[PDB]
Every structure is written in structure tokens, then in C-alpha cells.
Amino acid sequence: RKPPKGMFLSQEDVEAVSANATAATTVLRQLDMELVSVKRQIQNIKQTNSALKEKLDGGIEPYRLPEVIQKCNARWTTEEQLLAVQAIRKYGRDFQAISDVIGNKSVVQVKNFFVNYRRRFNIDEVLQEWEAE
Template identity: 25%
Template sequence: MIEIANDFAEMSKYVTEQPVEGDENASEDIEVVQAVKTKCSEETKAAMRELTRVRSRAIRLECTLKAQRAEGLMNGLDCYKYLTAKEDRKDEEGSSRRDRVRGGHTWTEEERIIAFHCLLRYGRDFDAVAEVLGTKTSDKVKSFYTDMKADIDKLLEKEAEKEQEIVSTFDVEKELSPEVQKTVEVVDIIDD
């Protein structure tokens, strides 16, 4: 308890600024008047600066993670294009499995890509996927998912593994530490 009281007393002390000796700008006729500063206000300012640094670093990290996730989704989208091409070949060969499930309803290539992308993002939330598509009901999205379940599940598992790997390798202490080691290069300029 005494330690807390001593800390409080230390925080309430005024910070005095000593004029610099030999300052040619100093004048006896002019005095600069400032609000009185305490150690508490100085520490508050330091904490605010640190908070700003941590927030900006967190935003940069968030952007980096979003970029990595988007890259992973685009790689998954390439795999999906292959899967839809395979499905189209099955349809051309006379397979009517898709027609049985959907009752003859067709999907455009754009709708397939959007549905696949949404399934990667929202998982098996068919209502959310249908809402994003706008042209399909959740039952039609579920039919689409059922039709390509094995292939989509493999890609969803790969995405979950990639995300888990990113999360497990992310070092919070290192990334959010206030003392970031910066590499400094010293360059000697030689005048001839």
C-alpha cells in the first residue's frame, strides 16, 4: 500500500524543464509560459504514442493476413475452375446427376465461381451463400454443394489447414512488441 502511495506521489510531481546553457535564442526579457506538466501527463503521452504504434502495427498485420488469405482463396479458385471443367465434361458425356438434383436448373460459370468463393468464405452456411448470390435459394446452393461435395470439402479442409498454419506460426509477442529491430545501413560519403 505504501508503494502505491509513493508511486502516486511520484506521478504528481511537476516536470521542470531546465533552460539550455549558452542558448543564443534565450533572452531575459522574454519568458515562455506553458501549462504545468506532471510526470503523469508525460507518462500518459508516452502511453498514447505507444498505443498509436501498436494500433498501426496491428492494422498492417491485419492487411498482411487479409492479403495472404485472398491469395489462398485465389489459388482455391483456380482449383475450382478445374473442378467445374471436370463437371462440364461429365455433363457432356451424358451424366444427368446434376439435373436430377436441381431439377433442370442451370448455373452460369459466374454463379459457380461466386458460390464456390462464398463456400470457402462462409463454410456450409447455405443461407449466406444464397444471399450473396441473389439469384439462387439456399436449397439450390445446398444442391450445388451436395453435387460437388467431395471436391469442395477437400478444398475447404485445405483452406482450414492453411489458416491454422498461419495462426500457429504467428508470433504475437514478436509482432506487437514495441521495440522493433530495424536494420540500419551506414553509408560513408567521401567528398573529393
């Protein structure tokens, strides 16, 4: 029913190697070439990647900032209100971004700010002028 485990004998393979005389040597050569072709492409990318690896030498450690861990607060100071409006002008409805910019306001507090002061801060106009970018 099936070939001995380890042999590979499909009906398709037999016909390609017996289609003529040197069809055996032809099939085994085009695979030898496709092997050499793939092997030299490996060393081309292995060298392209090795060059890109050296451009990253140093990581981004001289560019990381320390973690400013400030306790979240609930009262909106006049300063913090002004930070939020500009954050809306720059980030739109990205609540997590606005939360990080202000520092001590949760994601839902920023969303509550989007309604309480939507009247007095013209947040609709601020958002529509962000959509132009």
C-alpha cells in the first residue's frame, strides 16, 4: 500500500526521472543549481543583516529617560487643564497619550474631561482642527 518507511516514491516523481534518458541527470542538476542559488543568497542577507546589526551598536540606552512615577490625582489644576487642551490638539482621541502627557490623570479621567469641559474648552473645535492633520 505504501513504500518502505524512508523511501519516497510518488507516481509524479517516477515519470519526471524516466521521461527520457538524461532526465535523471537533468533533475539532479537543476536541484544542485537551486541549492547553490539559495546558499549564496543566504550569505548575501547574512552579510546585509550583519551590517545593519553594527548600526544598532549601543542600543538606545543613551536615549532612554528615567521612569517618572507620580501618584495619580483627581483634582484638575489650572495648569493640568491647559496641558490637556494642547494634548487634544496634538493627539486627538488618544486617551492613553493624553494621560501620559498630563502625568497624574487616568484614562477614564481624561475621558470624563472630554465631556465636562467640552462646553467651555470648545473641545469639538480642537478635535476638528486635529483631524486636519
